[PDB]
Amino acid sequence: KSKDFLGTGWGFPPEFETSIGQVKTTSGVEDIQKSLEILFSTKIGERIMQPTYGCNLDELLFSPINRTLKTYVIELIKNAILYHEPRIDPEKIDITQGNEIEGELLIHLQYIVRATNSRKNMVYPFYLEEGTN
Amino acid sequence: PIEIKELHIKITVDDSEDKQQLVAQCVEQVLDVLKSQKER
């Protein structure tokens, strides 16, 4: 019960059970992994009063793969995390092409979960006295 | 200053207006020190 500032919440593809009248929830590291799935699945203007939430990775569809592109991809990913996921620090972004013919680009993101609580983390019994900005 | 009572007339020297800006800052900080001393 030491790791209570990562928090608890709804699972992303919310599932409803009938063996008990409840919706499944996630916590800790599991919760972090689903947060990342949400962020990179939504476009910048799709939320109603949150006009700047999501990412622009679609800009790179139907384009050739080179050094300039790879640099741009890395920048897009790092900024989305700095703005929207306070609980982690990116470690490495590995961008490679696994198919000579099929139009595939493979991106592998590795990251580290923070041991100390961020000033941007809105978890209920903490942000009240620790959420300065 | 918030008062036109404390401005001085500007006279320059043809020695050939950097020195005009330094003297104007010194008059500003003296008159703020004199005003703060009359506070309770």
Binding site: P64, Y72, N79, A115, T116, K120 | -
Partner: protein
């Protein structure tokens, strides 16, 4: 596409988050610069008293960065891949100035710039420019010019606090390994060994002089007022 010679690009932007492009606001060069240069400065406070042999220099702040490079414009007709134009370099320089220099009445300022070439990616604003005109056609049309440029660096204030993840103010957790003691761990987290009885009370420990090697502890922050 390794074999492709990439060319340097500059794009203009409307907002401080760099997501809303200026329409027709992209410049692509025809000849790459030879080199580019960066500059980094850190400032310290160095006051000391008389009679002493050294000062413990203190951190003050980190100053903004600087990038510099040079360009060449030429439409004479000896460079493979390009054509000679009726008006020379007149439209190349006028499009370059519209992107990097001209005042924009929609935002009441000049444009935000993103500079990309290969591994390089830089955001900021223009500070200085010099353009010198070298060759001319007989009717006074220029066909060669040289430009020197200086760019400053821009960071938005919401992104500065996220990059300076500033952390006695926040909460912390550790796991006990064999060889740990409670006053040595308190010193590395707070800077003082004297808080060990407050850490033990917040965790419900009675026999704190022997810690078991699987326990997860919390370390609360210090109160502020």
């Amino acid at each position: 596409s390794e074999g492709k010679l990439e060319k340097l690009r500059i794009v203009a932007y409307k907002d401080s988050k760099f997501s809303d492009e200026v329409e027709n606001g992209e410049f692509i060069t025809l000849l790459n610069p030879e080199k580019y240069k960066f500059q980094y400065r850190v400032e310290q406070n160095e006051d000391q008293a008389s009679g002493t042999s050294s000062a413990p220099i203190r951190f003050n702040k980190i100053l903004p960065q600087t990038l510099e490079f040079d360009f060449l414009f030429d439409r004479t007709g000896v460079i493979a891949g390009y054509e000679v134009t009726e008006d020379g370099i007149i439209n190349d320089i006028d499009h370059f100035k519209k992107v990097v220099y001209d005042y924009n009445g929609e935002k009441h300022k000049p444009n935000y710039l993103m500079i990309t070439w290969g591994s390089l990616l830089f955001k900021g604003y223009l500070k200085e420019m010099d353009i010198e005109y070298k060759l001319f056609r007989p009717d006074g049309t220029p066909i060669r010019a040289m430009a020197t440029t200086k760019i400053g660096e821009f960071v938005e204030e919401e992104l500065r606090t996220a990059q300076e993840n500033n952390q006695p103010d926040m909460s912390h957790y550790r796991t006990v390994k064999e060889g740990d003691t409670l006053p040595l761990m308190t010193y590395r987290i707070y800077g003082d060994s004297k808080y060990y009885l407050e850490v033990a009370k917040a965790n419900g420990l009675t026999n704190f002089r022997r810690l078991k090697t699987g326990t997860e502890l919390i370390f609360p922050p210090l109160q502020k007022q």
